[PDB]
Design a protein around this ligand. Sequence first.
Ligand SMILES: *[C@@H]1O[C@H](CO)[C@@H](O[C@@H]2O[C@H](CO)[C@@H](O[C@@H]3O[C@H](CO)[C@@H](O)[C@H](O)[C@@H]3O)[C@H](O)[C@H]2NC(C)=O)[C@H](O)[C@H]1NC(C)=O
Ligand SMILES: *[C@@H]1O[C@H](CO[C@@H]2O[C@@H](C)[C@@H](O)[C@@H](O)[C@@H]2O)[C@@H](O[C@@H]2O[C@H](CO)[C@@H](O)[C@H](O)[C@H]2NC(C)=O)[C@H](O)[C@H]1NC(C)=O
Ligand SMILES: *[C@@H]1O[C@H](CO[C@@H]2O[C@@H](C)[C@@H](O)[C@@H](O)[C@@H]2O)[C@@H](O[C@@H]2O[C@H](CO)[C@@H](O)[C@H](O)[C@H]2NC(C)=O)[C@H](O)[C@H]1NC(C)=O
Ligand SMILES: Nc1ncnc2c1ncn2[C@@H]1O[C@H](COP(=O)(O)CP(=O)(O)OP(=O)(O)O)[C@@H](O)[C@H]1O
Ligand SMILES: *[C@@H]1O[C@H](CO)[C@@H](O[C@@H]2O[C@H](CO)[C@@H](O)[C@H](O)[C@H]2NC(C)=O)[C@H](O)[C@H]1NC(C)=O
Ligand SMILES: *[C@@H]1O[C@H](CO)[C@@H](O[C@@H]2O[C@H](CO)[C@@H](O)[C@H](O)[C@H]2NC(C)=O)[C@H](O)[C@H]1NC(C)=O
Ligand SMILES: *[C@@H]1O[C@H](CO[C@@H]2O[C@@H](C)[C@@H](O)[C@@H](O)[C@@H]2O)[C@@H](O)[C@H](O)[C@H]1NC(C)=O
Ligand SMILES: *[C@@H]1O[C@H](CO[C@@H]2O[C@@H](C)[C@@H](O)[C@@H](O)[C@@H]2O)[C@@H](O)[C@H](O)[C@H]1NC(C)=O
Ligand SMILES: [Ca+2]
Ligand SMILES: [Cl-]
Ligand SMILES: [Cl-]
Ligand SMILES: [Cl-]
Ligand code: NA
Ligand SMILES: [Zn+2]
Ligand SMILES: [Zn+2]
Length: 815
Amino acid sequence: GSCRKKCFDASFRGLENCRCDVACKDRGDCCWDFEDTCVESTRIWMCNKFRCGETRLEASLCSCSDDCLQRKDCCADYKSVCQGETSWLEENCDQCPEGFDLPPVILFSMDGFRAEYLYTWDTLMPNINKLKTCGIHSKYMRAMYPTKAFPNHYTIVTGLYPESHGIIDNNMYDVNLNKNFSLSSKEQNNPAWWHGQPMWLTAMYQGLKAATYFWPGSEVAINGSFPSIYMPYNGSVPFEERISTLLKWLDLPKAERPRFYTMYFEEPDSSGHAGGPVSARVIKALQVVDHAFGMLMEGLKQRNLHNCVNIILLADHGMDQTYCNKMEYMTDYFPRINFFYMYEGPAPRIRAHNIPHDFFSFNSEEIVRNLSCRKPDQHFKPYLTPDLPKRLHYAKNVRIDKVHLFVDQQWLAVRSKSNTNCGGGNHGYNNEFRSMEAIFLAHGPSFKEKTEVEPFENIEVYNLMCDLLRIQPAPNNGTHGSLNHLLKVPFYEPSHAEEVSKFSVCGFANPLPTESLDCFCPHLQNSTQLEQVNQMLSLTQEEITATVKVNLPFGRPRVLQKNVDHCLLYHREYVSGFGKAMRMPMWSSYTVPQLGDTSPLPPTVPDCLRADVRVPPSESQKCSFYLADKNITHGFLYPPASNRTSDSQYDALITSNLVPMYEEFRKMWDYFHSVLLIKHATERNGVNVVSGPIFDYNYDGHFDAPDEITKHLANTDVPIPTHYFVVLTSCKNKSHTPENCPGWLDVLPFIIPHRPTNVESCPEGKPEALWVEERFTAHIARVRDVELLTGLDFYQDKVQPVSEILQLKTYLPTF
Ligand SMILES: *[C@@H]1O[C@H](CO)[C@@H](O[C@@H]2O[C@H](CO)[C@@H](O[C@@H]3O[C@H](CO)[C@@H](O)[C@H](O)[C@@H]3O)[C@H](O)[C@H]2NC(C)=O)[C@H](O)[C@H]1NC(C)=O
Ligand SMILES: *[C@@H]1O[C@H](CO[C@@H]2O[C@@H](C)[C@@H](O)[C@@H](O)[C@@H]2O)[C@@H](O[C@@H]2O[C@H](CO)[C@@H](O)[C@H](O)[C@H]2NC(C)=O)[C@H](O)[C@H]1NC(C)=O
Ligand SMILES: *[C@@H]1O[C@H](CO[C@@H]2O[C@@H](C)[C@@H](O)[C@@H](O)[C@@H]2O)[C@@H](O[C@@H]2O[C@H](CO)[C@@H](O)[C@H](O)[C@H]2NC(C)=O)[C@H](O)[C@H]1NC(C)=O
Ligand SMILES: Nc1ncnc2c1ncn2[C@@H]1O[C@H](COP(=O)(O)CP(=O)(O)OP(=O)(O)O)[C@@H](O)[C@H]1O
Ligand SMILES: *[C@@H]1O[C@H](CO)[C@@H](O[C@@H]2O[C@H](CO)[C@@H](O)[C@H](O)[C@H]2NC(C)=O)[C@H](O)[C@H]1NC(C)=O
Ligand SMILES: *[C@@H]1O[C@H](CO)[C@@H](O[C@@H]2O[C@H](CO)[C@@H](O)[C@H](O)[C@H]2NC(C)=O)[C@H](O)[C@H]1NC(C)=O
Ligand SMILES: *[C@@H]1O[C@H](CO[C@@H]2O[C@@H](C)[C@@H](O)[C@@H](O)[C@@H]2O)[C@@H](O)[C@H](O)[C@H]1NC(C)=O
Ligand SMILES: *[C@@H]1O[C@H](CO[C@@H]2O[C@@H](C)[C@@H](O)[C@@H](O)[C@@H]2O)[C@@H](O)[C@H](O)[C@H]1NC(C)=O
Ligand SMILES: [Ca+2]
Ligand SMILES: [Cl-]
Ligand SMILES: [Cl-]
Ligand SMILES: [Cl-]
Ligand code: NA
Ligand SMILES: [Zn+2]
Ligand SMILES: [Zn+2]
């Protein structure tokens, strides 16, 4: 015989007197199968032909003995390797066993698994590829900025932007605590850094036990509590050991068995850093993680759990390649740099060197000014954080330093040329960069099968996981219901938000104005001319219904602000919502048709403004306000030169269509409406436009209350916007116009900062054709971002399921 079932038996002589004792290795008389049967069998996580039926040993990590199933310690592939059962991988695409009344949730993260890995190398990852084929598969998942591990892992489990959850980078300083946060320090375990409610506490608070294996934050007594089970972090733990512990937890008695699980792997992030995203090291790491993931599914199948668990496989961010010849140096821009401290790399920040003493005295403004437009080809742009694109939601936290550098693809910004941290993979860049996109795959009885879904953001996963466990989520930044199309039977059915402030009436009464408002239009020097022109503002009921049909084709925006007095101004070519206290419109809606001639609109007739007879002078702007205010002029919300009849431009040359605009912004503003808007209308077969002011002086992402607004027009109460929004909405099916679209819509939203100079664009002396469109593109945002910043709610009259409208409102155009 051989060593099968005779390991370490010195008294045993088999064929040709071969021996199976520990000393046979030296004497050189071992039976042929000794090493694999008796030595390597205690160092591996897999059964094989040598091990099946084996006699139990001591130091074995798992068992292939005939009693392992009753003892509950079989290796994961025992049944398929030893019992001839079909592996999970060999099974076709798709049930809970006894005691698993409800399906547990596994949240599985593979650090640095970028969406392109799954596109190019899927055939090198058969287990992951099987998950993608059989379950639900998003084109990619968008991370939050900056695309770092701790900020995004904690976003995933809280539903919160970093500015809200507190972990705004892997390295940061908090002047209030006067402490430093870093991944190698014990300060990261101070619960004071961790705000919000992570998913394992949401479950625990609502009666469901939670086990975490190495998830960021799970080793912290957040809000005073650890997870039910958690593991002190140690990256050296083999992945198979982690998977085996997860399967053991699923073997706990029902009364002790967690319902929510998290799992974390350092790969392919670690190999991405070492070798770059296209490298043998990443390829090998991708095969390793795929092997360990398969181990999990095989072990689930051994327990008949493969189709009972709702598993989500995703990642925190992607990976890009860096170069030592693509580095920007602060020494190139400052003669002395020893007075400030720099968080370096793909998403740098600059703060005072002497902290906490000079933290707030630091002249962040001068730093950003001296870094602006210094070279024509400089590969980063400095920002004060309130000036960053609003879709990043990266400003409202004292831990976010005011000075920020937004760095171009594959570049790095460092202090000095001494820096050698280059040549490998890195991340942290703009979350819209393709290289920073992450994967999201799910599978389970609650998910749809064999379904590909559009991209979505990692802030949406928290609500989804609460829906999977049928519990209520803590308040977060997801849009609940936006991921219902992932689910067979949604747990949460969304509904339209009900309007808070009802609209008033601004009907047409007297054709002459009680007050001139200090506005002048010599073209109407007589009174007969005025009465006729203003009469054009009088629309019949039939004319009101016609303009609403074309220019409000999805229904008016609803006001979710409280105690806001507003009325609707009907015109033939546009409808607006006038904010009485504000003395300017909250929104203006109009639909731009497709035209053959792409002739840019001509300039508005100048020197002609008059009052709105429908709006009383107490609630109207005065043209003298703008003359008085030397630092700001007036702009038009609805473009008057886009008139489609002989004298309809008069309908736009009224005080009710005026908004405060710095001269330099209005140049940008008018170019967009005169040139770019027309192109968008011709490409989209017409486009509906809704535009208006945004006030966010505390840069918290929410509309300001009137008493939060700190800048006003001249000596009046008329506020100056911080931003203007422009939402372009057309029919996804280009065969239809925006007003005759029975299917899905297609949106392109802008949130353009209203700044007194164009230094963000470094015009330098170039025509607007060479930088305006670039500036607007940099400030694309979601509709929901506009809703949050305005207190408005869109598309409520679009006949379509709410959850599909929620998909539309979370969509981010990318380029
Ligand atoms: C941090 O942990 C504490 C627990 O120590 C959480 O406080 C608990 O919050 C829940 C939900 O708000 C409270 O339950 C509610 O109480 C009201 C008042 O009777 C009741 O009407 C509701 O139906 C619900 O039962 C609970 O009382 C409260 N516990 C304590 C001791 O204050 C807190 O929410 C956690 N915070 C975060 C951010 O995780
Ligand atoms: C920030 O820059 C100012 C201005 O410096 C000039 O503009 C820069 C954008 C860059 O092009 C420099 O090469 C220019 O010299 C600095 O203010 C100047 O400082 C020098 C001292 O070296 C002084 O002699 C000048 O009078 C200053 N000019 C003004 C208008 O004040 C300032 O020092 C820079 N700030 C920091 C922190 O370095
Ligand atoms: C859109 O309106 C422009 C402007 O109309 C002029 O300005 C208004 C404020 C009002 O004073 C009107 O009575 C004016 O006609 C139209 O451009 C004018 O077009 C006429 C006839 O084609 C021409 O004689 C004028 O010189 C033009 N004036 C300017 C400043 O361009 C334009 O025709 C209107 N578009 C359509 C489709 O009717
Ligand atoms: N609970 C945990 N505790 C400590 N470290 C963890 C952790 N979970 C993951 N990590 C570590 O997070 C690291 C990945 O995060 P990264 O964003 O790549 C760090 P970085 O910002 O690129 O540079 P840095 O190392 O200077 O912080 C992994 O190497 C891993 O060791
Ligand atoms: C947090 O880390 C910073 C460096 O990242 C420390 O900064 C030092 O601050 C002291 C005075 O506070 C200065 O004398 C040193 O020159 C600073 N060092 C550097 C490298 O800038 C800071 O001390 C740390 N704070 C805490 C509480 O640990
Ligand atoms: C993201 O969601 C969080 C949680 O709902 C919001 O944070 C709250 O904001 C209000 C008003 O700013 C504060 O009074 C609360 O204290 C905040 N809570 C927390 C936990 O920070 C946040 O406003 C949302 N962000 C956006 C951009 O909408
Ligand atoms: C980190 O992990 C290393 C690898 O072994 C693992 O940890 C030991 C303690 C056992 O739990 C073993 O089953 C694991 O695979 C250890 O060698 C090392 O000591 C650990 N370091 C720390 C600080 O815990
Ligand atoms: C778009 O919609 C088409 C049906 O629309 C009707 O037919 C076309 C030709 C136009 O005349 C339109 O005004 C009509 O209402 C579908 O047949 C077609 O598949 C759709 N296209 C896409 C890309 O979805
Ligand atoms: Ca605000
Ligand atoms: Cl089954
Ligand atoms: Cl003026
Ligand atoms: Cl500016
Ligand atoms: Na002025
Ligand atoms: Zn990472
Ligand atoms: Zn990393």
